[PDB]
Design a protein around this motif. Structure first.
Motif, PDB file in Angstrom:
ATOM      1  N   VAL A  66      -8.457   2.009   3.957  1.00  0.00           N
ATOM      2  CA  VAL A  66      -7.297   2.777   3.520  1.00  0.00           C
ATOM      3  C   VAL A  66      -7.770   3.944   2.662  1.00  0.00           C
ATOM      4  N   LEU A 118       0.796  -1.233   0.000  1.00  0.00           N
ATOM      5  CA  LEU A 118       0.000   0.000   0.000  1.00  0.00           C
ATOM      6  C   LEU A 118       0.831   1.287   0.000  1.00  0.00           C
ATOM      7  N   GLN A 119       1.082   1.790  -1.207  1.00  0.00           N
ATOM      8  CA  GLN A 119       1.823   3.022  -1.431  1.00  0.00           C
ATOM      9  C   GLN A 119       0.847   4.141  -1.795  1.00  0.00           C
ATOM     10  N   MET A 120       0.202   4.720  -0.786  1.00  0.00           N
ATOM     11  CA  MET A 120      -0.837   5.731  -1.029  1.00  0.00           C
ATOM     12  C   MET A 120      -0.286   7.114  -1.396  1.00  0.00           C
ATOM     13  N   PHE A 121      -0.918   7.712  -2.408  1.00  0.00           N
ATOM     14  CA  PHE A 121      -0.583   9.036  -2.924  1.00  0.00           C
ATOM     15  C   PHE A 121      -1.621  10.028  -2.420  1.00  0.00           C
ATOM     16  N   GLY A 122      -1.269  11.307  -2.359  1.00  0.00           N
ATOM     17  CA  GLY A 122      -2.227  12.308  -1.890  1.00  0.00           C
ATOM     18  C   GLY A 122      -1.718  13.726  -1.731  1.00  0.00           C
ATOM     19  N   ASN A 176      -8.885   8.362   2.713  1.00  0.00           N
ATOM     20  CA  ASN A 176      -8.668   9.632   3.380  1.00  0.00           C
ATOM     21  C   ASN A 176      -9.881  10.077   4.178  1.00  0.00           C
ATOM     22  N   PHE A 202       4.474   4.170   2.581  1.00  0.00           N
ATOM     23  CA  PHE A 202       4.301   2.709   2.537  1.00  0.00           C
ATOM     24  C   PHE A 202       3.832   2.119   3.869  1.00  0.00           C
ATOM     25  N   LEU A 231      -3.517  15.224   6.463  1.00  0.00           N
ATOM     26  CA  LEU A 231      -4.443  14.321   5.819  1.00  0.00           C
ATOM     27  C   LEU A 231      -4.563  13.061   6.662  1.00  0.00           C
TER      28      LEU A 231
END
Lengths: 49, 293, 98
Positions: free
Chosen positions: B41, B3-7, B43, B288, B34
């Protein structure tokens, strides 16, 4: 007394040197294989990597 | 998974879990904290207001109130349930660099480029204490007891101060350069520390000598404040580096996991309070959740 | 002034009067004469009780005030997740050097 003790100890210790080493090595390769070729998706130790 | 979250839009700095282990918070140069879930997972709130960039988050031990440390002297406070402002702890005359919190969520410590440590109450809106050293300070940690506060500066000298005495009781030695993050264990019995010499040393709390110098995690020209953490057991140590690698140690003096993944310098590594997960943040705008089965 | 008095609003109160009697209940409305309005009231003359309901006391009659109990009773940010990947860099060393 001494003969029966020597058989049981050799049975307990020496049994895991063959198949358990190859089975764990295959499962270590399989996680790395499922991880693809150029992206370490399986979180292995640095020495094994 | 990983889980490589972008934002985030720009360099992210700090990312932390709740004490419970049910959220992330994250926020760097965006001027936007955020919030996240752990287990779909997604926001949540865009906590907006800080007019300087964020340098440090910390959940209140109630798992409701959040505290920032902007580059414009403010230390903000946020109701994570609703997402409204509470206060602007106006004090320092420069850029704040670190924060720390107690059991009792009531007391906070901040660290400026005015060379001033300051203890805050969440009820006054003013400083309770003001400890002026000399060279701009950088990292701070407060113990579980609510007694000892550790200061990290530019001399390489982690000084120790109590809340009763206010005297230079002890000074850690053998660190040649710069401190980027202190970190007291879940015992209250040992620190962690990132120096610019790349010696990620552990220290003692009570005799007060070293334990284990770890070596293999470089800082360079970037001059970001890199982080370190204690794992929930206090077995593992998680230090990030400007080499794009999260150098996890064995705490016995052995490098176990060295996982890359980031494309830029790493900042603040963390650990989840129970299940083995690693929050790793980096200028990159990415994060990550590295696991162990 | 009367800044403190607004703070008491909607709390269960214990009000002693000049007669000695003590009324109890929440506070709905308040005055400059200290006229209190109280909801679901109960006197305690003294091993005694009575149910009244809504009671409006005068200022003359009231002595003291005391709280019995406390007052009775950003959607989704830009961020998105993804799965895994963990690319290996050919180069080592720091970010800025080369």
């Amino acid at each position: 007394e001494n003969s029966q003790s020597p058989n049981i100890q050799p049975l307990l210790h020496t049994e895991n040197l063959a198949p358990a080493v190859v089975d764990n090595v295959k499962d270590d390769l399989i996680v790395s294989k499922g991880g693809n070729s150029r992206e370490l998706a399986r979180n292995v130790p640095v020495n094994e990597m | 998974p990983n889980l490589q979250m972008f934002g985030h839009t720009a360099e992210v700095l700090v990312a932390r879990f709740d004490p419970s282990g049910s959220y992330f918070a994250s926020g760097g140069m965006d001027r936007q904290i955020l919030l996240w879930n752990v287990f779909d997972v997604k926001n949540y709130g865009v906590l907006n207001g800080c007019k300087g960039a964020i340098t440090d988050l910390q959940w209140s031990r109630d798992s409701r109130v959040v505290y920032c440390s902007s580059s414009d002297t403010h230390l903000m406070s946020w109701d994570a349930v609703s997402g409204q402002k509470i206060r602007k702890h106006k004090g320092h005359a420069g850029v704040v660099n670190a924060l720390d919190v107690l059991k009792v969520s009531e007391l906070l410590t901040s660290v400026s480029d005015d060379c001033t440590m300051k203890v805050w109450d969440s009820r006054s809106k003013d400083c309770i204490k003001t400890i002026e050293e000399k060279y701009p300070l950088t990292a701070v940690a407060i113990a579980q007891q609510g007694t000892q506060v550790f200061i990290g500066g530019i001399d390489g000298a982690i000084k120790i101060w109590d809340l009763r005495n206010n005297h230079c009781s002890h000074v850690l030695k053998g660190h040649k350069d710069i401190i980027t993050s202190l970190a007291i264990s879940k015992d209250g019995s040992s620190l962690l520390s990132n120096s610019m010499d790349n010696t990620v040393r552990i220290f003692d709390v009570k005799a007060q000598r070293q334990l284990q110098i770890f070596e293999g995690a470089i800082h360079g020209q970037e001059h970001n404040l890199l982080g370190v953490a204690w794992s929930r057991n206090s077995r593992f140590v998680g230090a990030g580096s400007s080499d794009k690698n999260v150098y996890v140690w064995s705490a016995t003096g052995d490098l176990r996991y060295v996982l890359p993944g980031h494309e830029g310098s790493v900042n603040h590594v963390d650990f989840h309070p129970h299940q083995d997960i690693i929050l790793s943040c980096s200028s990159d705008r990415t994060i990550f959740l590295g696991e162990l089965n | 002034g009367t800044t403190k008095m607004v703070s008491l609003l909607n709390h269960s109160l214990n009000v002693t009067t000049k007669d000695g009697r003590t009324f109890v209940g929440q506070l709905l409305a308040f005055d400059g004469f200290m006229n209190l309005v109280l909801s679901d009231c109960q006197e305690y003359r003294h091993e005694e009780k009575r149910m009244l309901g809504l009671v409006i006391l005068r200022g003359e009659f009231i002595v003291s005030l005391s709280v019995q109990g406390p007052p009775p009773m950003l959607l989704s940010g830009p961020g998105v997740a993804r799965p895994a990947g963990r690319g290996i860099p050919l180069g080592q060393a720091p970010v800025g050097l080369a």
